[PDB]
Amino acid sequence: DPVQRYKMLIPQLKESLQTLMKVAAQNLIQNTNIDNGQKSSDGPIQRFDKCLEEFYALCDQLELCLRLAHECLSQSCDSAKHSPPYPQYLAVIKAQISCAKDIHTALLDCANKV
């Protein structure tokens, strides 16, 4: 379900990335403080590595959805460019495969002939 899922992740991805940059700033401020002493923060930490990993994860899920979309789309399009009888369809399939293989093997033969 490519379109709805992509539209569902993109806002979620934006929210995750905004959280990510904010936690990056939070930990950097906290740590440069504690290095320069000068102060501390009693509040919780909001661990950062987790946030970066969650963002990478969401990026990965979107990658999956979108690759599946492109591959299934190209599959269906190439199926169109070579088709319009279920057993007859299987038959024309077997024929197609045979023809492709014969082309490939003739090319292999002339190449091996050197």
Partner 1 sequence: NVSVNLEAFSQAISAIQALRSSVSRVFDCLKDGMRNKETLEGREKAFIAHFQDNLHSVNRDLNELERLSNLVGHNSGLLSLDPVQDKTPLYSQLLQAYKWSNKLQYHAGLASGLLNQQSLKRSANQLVLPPQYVDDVISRIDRMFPEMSIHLSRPNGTSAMLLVTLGKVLKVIVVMRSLFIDRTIVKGYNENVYTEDGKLDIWSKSNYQVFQKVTDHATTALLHYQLPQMPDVVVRSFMTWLRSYIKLFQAPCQRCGKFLQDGLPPTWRDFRTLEAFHDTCRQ
Partner 2 sequence: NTASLCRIGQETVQDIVYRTMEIFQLLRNMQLPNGTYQDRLTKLQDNLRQLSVLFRKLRLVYDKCNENCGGMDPIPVEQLIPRREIAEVNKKLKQKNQQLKQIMDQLRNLIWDINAMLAMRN
Partner 3 sequence: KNKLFIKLTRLPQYYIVVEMLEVPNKPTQLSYKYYFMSVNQTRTNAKRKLSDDAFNKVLAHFVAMCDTNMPFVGLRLELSNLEIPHQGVQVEGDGFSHAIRLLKIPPCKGITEETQKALDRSLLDCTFRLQGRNNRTWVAELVFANCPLNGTSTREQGPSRHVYLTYENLLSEPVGGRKVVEMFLNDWNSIARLYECVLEFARSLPDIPAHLNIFSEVRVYNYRKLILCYGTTKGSSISIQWNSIHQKFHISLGTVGPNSGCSNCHNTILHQLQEMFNKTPNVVQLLQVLFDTQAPLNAINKLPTVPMLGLTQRTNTAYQCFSILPQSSTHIRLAFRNMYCIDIYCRSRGVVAIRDGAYSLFDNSKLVEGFYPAPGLKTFLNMFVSWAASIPTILTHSALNILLLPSPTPLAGSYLCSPLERFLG
**Shorter beta-carbon distance to partner 3: residue 40 or 78:** 78
Q: Which DSSP string corresponds to 25-67?
A: HHHHHHHHHHHS-S----S----HHHHHHHHHHHHHHHHHHHH
CB 40, CB 106: distance < 8 Å: no
Q: Does 26 bind partner 1 (CB under 8 A)?
A: no
Q: Does 14 bind partner 1 (CB under 8 A)?
A: yes
d(CA 10, CA 7) in angstroms, rounded, equals 6
Question: Which residues within the stretch 40-59 sit at the binding site for partner 1 (CB under 8 A)?
Answer: 52, 55-56, 59
Binding segment for partner 2 (CB under 8 A), chosen from 26-34, 36-44, 50-58, 100-108, is 100-108
Q: How far is the CB of 102 from partner 1 (least distance, A)?
A: 11
